[PDB]
């Protein structure tokens, strides 16, 4: 019955308003591969709004690997990993990720989002504590919520705040600190040396979410612990397959005894169907390519350094990024919607960040690089961004 439910959604008018103003640019239907150019409504659009950092969703070897897995294993496993849903190729990918991130063992999840729900929901319990960076990814907040522990946020990369909040807690309790490695909104990196130094003093477990770090930072792209040399001070390395690795799914890696607890206790792996064979095979082949072919990570960083230099040279106001995510400040929700739509209609795809996710005065567009971007494409997009910023008067 719909009376009260109608009242619950009645106040949500922003989508109605965007559409009526001709500004709506969410759920843009793409008709082509995710690439440096995408087809929308039969037109070509430069893509600077992707998380495919290495451009690998179009790699013919990864496509063929997925196509070959479909031929061999079919379209799905039709069950959870713990029952009828495990393949030899799931185990092969867990061994290969374990090796890549320098951990004993790993467990796959069918999404990155579910990869965070697993360890955050089931390791800390009643009388325990989870400490979260206040800018942690939504999946980390939600995972923590599914625990029976007390969830405490600390100031973004604020090590004094972390230390103070940990010092307040009963000695006779377990604590786990979970942080994004690279934070997607502003593209900044966790202070993992100070965080792990505090974790060690309070015997708190450390989990890092490397969704935006894998294939971006660390040796051969192995992530944030690898970037800092701190493998031995990080208990759990969580990753996704939906960004550099050009697929769908994720993993948590760590000590064999912890991973064995997780694979048997995490509801998001016990009660959700396993990764499709095609996604396992595309993840396996992408992981081989990132290691074997250092070109991809090098070119991603050539493009990032070029684009960032060009944007600062044109007088754009950039967020404190340390990654291929280049946040461009606009500081008006209405201009941010207008700029996004004008760029879309001129053939540039960027992602807006607006209220209520951020305060109006910190509203921005995110311009993300891929390894397969050319300097010609970056130049065309920045030229159009200068024109649209001028028309929008920012």
Ligand X SMILES: Cc1ncc(COP(=O)(O)O)c(/C=N/C(CO)(CO)CO)c1O
Q: Which of residues 288-347 bind a copy of itself (CB under 8 A)?
A: none
- Let me know if 212 is a catalytic residue: yes
Is the distance from CB of 335 to CB of 367 less than 8 angstroms? no
Among 94, 133, 209, 235, binds ligand X (CB under 6 A): 209
If contact means CB under 5 to 8 A according to the sort of partner, which of ligand X, a copy of itself, none does residue 145 touch?
Answer: a copy of itself
- At what angle are helices 333-345 and 375-392 packed, to 10 degrees? 130
Among 59, 94, 128, 180, binds ligand X (CB under 6 A): 180
Q: Write down the catalytic residue from 212, 227, 308, 335.
A: 212
C-alpha distance across the termini of the chain, in Å: 47
The interface mask with a copy of itself, positions 172-211, x = CB under 8 A, is: -xxxx----------------------xx-xxxxx-----
Please choose, from the candidates 143, 311, 319, 300, the residue with its C-alpha nearest in 3D space to the C-alpha of residue 212.
Answer: 300
> How does 359-393 read in b/e, with b if 16+ C-beta sit within 10 Å?
eeebbbbbbbbbbbbeeebbeebbebbeebbeebe
Phi, psi at 254, each rounded to 5°: 175, -155
- Let me know if 264 is a catalytic residue: no
Among 52, 57, 98, 111, binds ligand X (CB under 6 A): 111
The answer to whether residue 21 forms part of the interface with a copy of itself (CB under 8 A) is: no
Residues in the chain followed by a break, C to N above 2.5 angstroms = none
The answer to whether residue 355 forms part of the interface with a copy of itself (CB under 8 A) is: no
Tokens of 107: 């467990």
If contact means CB under 5 to 8 A according to the sort of partner, which of ligand X, a copy of itself, none does residue 315 touch?
Answer: none
Strands (E), 1-78: 37-40, 43-47
Tokens of 128: 């325990």
Is the distance from CB of 218 to CB of 253 less than 8 angstroms? no
In whole angstroms, give the CA distance from residue 179 to residue 287: 23
The answer to whether residue 240 forms part of the interface with ligand X (CB under 6 A) is: yes
Q: What is the β-pairing status of strands 175-180 and 205-209? A: parallel
For ligand X, give the closer residue by CB, 58 or 80: 80
For a copy of itself, give the closer residue by CB, 22 or 29: 29
For a copy of itself, give the closer residue by CB, 11 or 313: 11
For a copy of itself, give the closer residue by CB, 62 or 222: 62
In whole angstroms, give the CA distance from residue 131 to residue 151: 6
The answer to whether residue 215 forms part of the interface with ligand X (CB under 6 A) is: no
Q: Write down the catalytic residue from 184, 247, 274, 368.
A: 184
The answer to whether residue 55 forms part of the interface with ligand X (CB under 6 A) is: no
For ligand X, give the closer residue by CB, 212 or 308: 212
The interface mask with ligand X, positions 324-363, x = CB under 6 A, is: ----------------------------------------
Is the distance from CB of 98 to CB of 104 less than 8 angstroms? yes
Return the bridge partners of 132, or none: 153, 178
Instruction: Report DSSP state, residue 276.
Output: P
Annotated binding site for pyridoxal 5'-phosphate: 112-113, 212, 240, 242
Q: How many residues bind ligand X (CB under 6 A)?
A: 20
Instruction: Report DSSP state, residue 60.
Output: H
For a copy of itself, give the closer residue by CB, 71 or 313: 71
Q: How far is the CB of 205 from a copy of itself (least distance, A)?
A: 4
Q: Which stretch binds a copy of itself (CB under 8 A): 112-120, 152-160, 314-322, 386-394?
A: 112-120
Please choose, from the candidates 163, 166, 175, the residue with its C-alpha nearest in 3D space to the C-alpha of residue 127.
Answer: 175
Contacts of residue 256, defined as CB under 8 A and 6 or more positions apart, other chains included, come to 104, 105
Query: Which sign, positive or negative, has the C-alpha torsion 354, 356, 357, 363?
Result: positive
- Let me know if 137 is a catalytic residue: no
Q: Which stretch binds a copy of itself (CB under 8 A): 136-144, 288-296, 320-328, 375-383?
A: 136-144
Q: How far is the CB of 65 from ligand X (least distance, A)?
A: 19
**Residue ranges that bind ligand X, judged by CB under 6 A:** 51, 79-80, 111-113, 116, 137, 139, 180, 184, 209, 211-212, 240, 242, 250, 271-273
Catalytic residues: 184, 212, 243
């Amino acid at each position: 019955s719909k009376g009260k439910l109608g009242e619950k959604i009645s106040q949500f008018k922003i989508v109605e308003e965007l559409k009526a103003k001709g500004l709506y640019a969410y759920f843009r239907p793409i008709q082509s591969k995710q690439d440096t150019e995408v087809k929308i409504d039969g037109r070509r659009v430069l893509m600077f709004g992707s998380n495919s950092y290495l451009g690998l969703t179009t790699d013919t070897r990864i496509i063929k690997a997925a196509q070959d897995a479909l031929e061999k294993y079919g379209t799905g496993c039709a069950g959870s990993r713990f029952l009828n849903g495990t393949l030899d190729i799931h185990v092969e990918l867990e061994e290969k990720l374990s090796a890549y991130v320098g951990k004993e063992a790993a467990i796959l999840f069918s999404t990155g989002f579910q990869s965070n729900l697993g360890p955050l929901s089931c390791l800390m319990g009643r009388n325990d504590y989870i400490l979260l960076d206040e800018r942690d990814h939504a999946s980390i907040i939600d995972g923590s919520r599914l625990s029976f522990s007390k969830v405490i946020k600390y100031g973004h990369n604020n090590m004094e705040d972390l230390r103070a909040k940990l010092s307040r807690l009963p000695e006779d309790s377990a604590k786990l600190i979970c942080t994004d490695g690279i934070f997607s909104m502003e593209g900044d990196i966790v202070n993992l040396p100070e965080l792990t130094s505090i974790a060690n003093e309070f015997d708190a477990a450390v989990m890092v979410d490397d969704a935006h770090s894998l294939g971006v930072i660390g040796h051969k792209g192995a992530g944030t612990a690898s970037h800092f040399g701190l493998n031995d001070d990080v208990d759990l390395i969580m990753g996704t397959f939906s960004k550099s690795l050009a697929s769908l799914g994720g993993f948590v890696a760590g000590d064999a005894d912890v991973i064995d607890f997780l694979k048997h206790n995490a509801r998001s792996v016990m009660f959700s169907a396993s990764m499709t064979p095609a996604s396992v095979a595309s993840t396996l082949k992408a992981l081989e390519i990132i290691q074997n072919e250092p070109e991809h990570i090098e070119k991603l960083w050539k493009n990032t350094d070029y684009a960032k230099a060009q944007l600062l040279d044109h007088g754009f106001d950039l967020g404190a990024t340390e990654s291929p995510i280049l946040p461009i400040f606009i500081r008006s929700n209405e201009k941010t919607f207008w700029v996004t739509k004008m760029l879309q209609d001129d053939g540039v795809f960027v992602n807006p960040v607006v209220s209520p996710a951020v305060p109006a005065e910190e509203s921005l567009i995110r311009f993300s690089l891929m390894a397969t971007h050319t300097y010609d494409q970056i130049d065309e997009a920045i030229e159009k961004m200068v024109k649209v910023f001028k028309q929008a008067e920012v």
